[PDB]
Design a protein around this ligand. Structure first.
Ligand SMILES: CSc1ccc(Br)cc1CC(=O)N1CCC[C@H](C(N)=O)C1
Ligand SMILES: [Zn+2]
Length: 139
């Protein structure tokens, strides 16, 4: 679990969105596993606007932050699950690192701010859904 709070928005993994998230929906994309809902209170997370490939992510299954090198956002195959059929998830970035299904939502940050959230994993790898291109989260 985990969310990004920026302005009047809440950013979560689409496969983990609540009833409240869907009743206050702003935008959603199954192909990115992202969902954005509106909030009453203000959010103080800063989104990075950069092409950084290094950063730190929170891993809840270890209660630890890990530094990582990560790939550029791209279309990557993701095996079927209870939430989606087997497909290409777009805007996905991979790193060598530990993750388990309950790790989705952990924030990945660089020196510029929030880069994205844990969305995939398996075989000593961790996948992050990028949010750096969502320029509207600030305006
Ligand atoms: C950090 S998630 C994870 C980590 C290790 C292992 Br084994 C398995 C997982 C689970 C996982 O990758 N998915 C299930 C939830 C939907 C995800 C998606 N974005 O399509 C795919
Ligand atoms: Zn950066």
């Amino acid at each position: 679990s985990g969310a990004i709070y920026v302005g009047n928005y809440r950013v979560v993994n689409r496969h983990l969105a609540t009833h409240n998230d869907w009743a206050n929906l702003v935008w959603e994309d199954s192909s990115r596993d992202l969902l954005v809902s509106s909030t009453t209170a203000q959010g103080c997370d800063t989104i990075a606007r950069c092409d950084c490939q290094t950063g730190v992510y929170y891993c809840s299954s270890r209660r630890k932050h890990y530094p990582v090198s990560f790939s550029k956002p791209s279309l990557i195959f993701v095996e079927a699950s209870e939430y989606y059929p087997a497909r290409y998830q777009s805007h996905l970035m991979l790193a060598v690192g530990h993750s388990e299904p309950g790790d989705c939502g952990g924030i990945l940050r660089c020196q510029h701010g929030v880069v994205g959230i844990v969305s995939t994993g398996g075989n000593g790898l961790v996948g992050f859904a990028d949010v750096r291109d969502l320029l509207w989260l600030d305006e």
